Ligand binder design. Structure first.
Ligand SMILES: Brc1ccnc2ncccc12
Ligand SMILES: Brc1ccnc2ncccc12
Ligand SMILES: Brc1ccnc2ncccc12
Lengths: 262, 299
């Protein structure tokens, strides 16, 4: 019914596909950042995961914030001492965009341990808005995932939660997920989730919707599959901790499959 | 791309939440614009979420039936939204079109354009969520455009739970009034439905003074809904069995001057069940519009 917008779902999907290309960060920006690294970004993203858990924020908000961070770091050189200020302003903006009840600015100041002032946070908010030119309605992995979900026959909450988890893991590591579009990571995540839980594969019906096959997703899948296998050892662990919760059907406790068989 | 030194203020023309709207003139190009000032010096939480949604969503919606945001002047204590100027809103026009009434060609033209604008919104994952005549701007050429996207929201598919009790009450869809967990594009259609009726009668179709009075006014016109007309209704969070059960009056009594085609379209806009309620896209093909044109306003 109308909650799945049947008269507009195609138009929307087509429009997000176009917009994900426009809202895309530069794949090679870390090497051009003098003072920050993939590892510093991973620490930041893993922290924003924890911030969303503490403030009971939508998963969509987290994804928006990272989109904003990556786009910002694509044109703006940032000292490591200021990396977190950017991420805080990013999470505030995402929250004001996406959440019914965003946390107050004071709360954002508080989660930074008074590293930064309220004045610093509000000034970085204006800068990110200037650098992004207010282009905040960015497609996220989640917006694709939720549409992919409508193709499940039948629907499996473990499939859905496990896809959310995997897509979320991908936020942590610019190498190699900066090279892949939201829509392609969501497709890898959905297939990997479906295969893990039920043994089934990317459906004919999503080939029709997306144009993606297992042929075209294979690069992101091989990466995502490694990230899943290695996730217990990753230095960042907030996402796994998060997906132990029953809210997400404890999907981080499922065993990854050893092999994908193409 | 712009600066306030090339604008000349002319007169106040309105008010939003974050301040006044001003008519101004670009001194280099001649263009007439509306300036919406958003207070930031007074803002202790930074840029308002209303403004962030308004600006981000409007930069993407380039359509002839959506008010065009031309520019954003980001000073340090001030934020100025530059829109194309339109002369009047639909509410002012309806009040000045009394005694004569709005001519059907123009009602039909305006409704048609409104549907084009809303459909374009819905096609770009955008709910307007405050459609009412005060927020629909008309020009001297015959255009009408959706405006005030301050309560608007980017939706995902399927929708999740968004802010409750949105839409000015007289225009709020029943599924919001019943506190449903999820609402979708159909809430905007409901608003246009009310507006359609309103253009014909020049008075609001459901002028309630409370959420419950609003429901009861709706029920007394469309009949109290049950599981047959609207499966789920008796389960909705704020459905109550004690609701009086009113008969659906014949729909030709709701808006007597309306013709067969108009009635058909209005009934489909005010269907209880958000799943059966017509979409903006489908409504464009309805025979009501078989002879539609774009005439200038008569006044
Ligand atoms: Br067939 C076809 C084409 C485009 N999109 C589609 N989405 C879902 C199911 C089938 C589709
Ligand atoms: Br014209 C115009 C554009 C934007 N907002 C407006 N608010 C009030 C009156 C006219 C407006
Ligand atoms: Br525009 C237009 C032109 C001709 N016939 C039409 N029928 C229905 C809706 C719009 C129409």
């Amino acid at each position: 019914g109308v909650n799945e917008v049947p008269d507009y779902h195609e138009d929307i999907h087509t429009y997000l596909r176009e917009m994900e290309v426009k809202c895309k960060p530069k794949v090679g920006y870390m090497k051009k950042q003098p003072d920050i690294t993939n590892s510093m970004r991973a620490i930041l993203v893993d922290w924003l995961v924890e911030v969303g858990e503490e403030y009971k924020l939508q998963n969509e908000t987290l994804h928006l914030a990272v989109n904003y961070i990556d786009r910002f770091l694509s044109s703006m050189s940032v000292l490591r001492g200021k990396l977190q200020l950017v991420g805080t302003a990013a999470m505030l903006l995402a929250s004001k965009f996406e959440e019914i009840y965003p946390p107050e600015v004071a709360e954002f100041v508080y989660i930074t341990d008074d590293t930064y002032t309220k004045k610093q946070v509000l000034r970085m908010e204006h800068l990110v808005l200037k650098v992004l030119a207010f282009d905040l309605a960015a497609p996220t992995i989640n917006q694709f995932l939720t549409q992919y979900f409508l193709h499940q026959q039948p629907a499996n909450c473990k499939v859905e939660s496990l896809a959310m988890f995997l897509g979320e893991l991908s936020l942590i590591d610019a190498d190699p997920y900066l090279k892949y579009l939201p829509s392609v990571i969501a497709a890898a995540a959905f297939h990997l989730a479906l295969y893990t839980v039920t043994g089934q594969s990317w459906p004919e019906s999503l080939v029709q919707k997306t144009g993606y096959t297992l042929e075209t997703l294979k690069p992101c899948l091989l990466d995502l599959h490694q990230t899943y296998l290695r996730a217990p050892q990753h230095a960042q662990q907030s996402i796994r901790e998060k997906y132990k919760n029953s809210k997400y059907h404890g999907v981080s406790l499922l065993n990854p499959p050893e092999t994908l068989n193409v | 791309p712009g600066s306030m030194e090339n604008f000349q203020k002319v007169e106040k023309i309105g008010e939003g939440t974050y301040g006044v709207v001003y008519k101004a003139r670009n001194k280099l190009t001649g263009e007439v614009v509306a300036l919406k000032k958003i207070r930031l010096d007074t803002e202790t939480e930074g840029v308002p979420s209303t403004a962030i949604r308004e600006i981000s969503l409007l930069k993407e919606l380039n359509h002839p039936n959506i008010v065009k945001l031309l520019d954003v002047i980001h000073t340090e204590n001030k934020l100025y939204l530059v829109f194309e100027f339109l002369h009047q809103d639909l509410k002012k026009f309806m009040d000045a079109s009394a005694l004569t009434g709005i001519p059907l060609p123009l009602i039909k033209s305006y409704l048609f354009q409104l549907l084009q604008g809303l459909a374009f919104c819905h096609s770009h994952r955008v709910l307007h969520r405050d459609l009412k005549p005060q927020n629909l701007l008309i020009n001297t050429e015959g255009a009408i455009k959706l405006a005030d996207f301050g309560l608007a929201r980017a939706f995902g598919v399927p929708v999740r739970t968004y802010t409750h009790e949105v839409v000015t009450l007289w225009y709020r869809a029943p599924e919001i009034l019943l506190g449903c967990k999820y609402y979708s594009t159909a809430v905007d259609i409901w608003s246009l439905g009310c507006i359609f009726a309103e253009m014909v009668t020049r008075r609001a179709l459901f002028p309630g003074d409370s959420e419950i009075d609003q429901l009861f006014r709706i029920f007394r016109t469309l009949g109290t809904p049950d599981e047959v007309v609207w499966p789920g209704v008796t389960s909705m969070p704020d459905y109550k069995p004690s609701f009086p059960k009113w008969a659906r009056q014949d729909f030709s009594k709701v808006v007597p001057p309306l013709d067969e085609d108009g009635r058909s379209l209005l009934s489909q806009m005010l269907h209880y069940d958000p799943n059966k309620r017509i979409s903006a896209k489908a409504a464009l093909a309805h025979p009501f519009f078989q002879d539609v044109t774009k005439p200038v306003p008569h006044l």
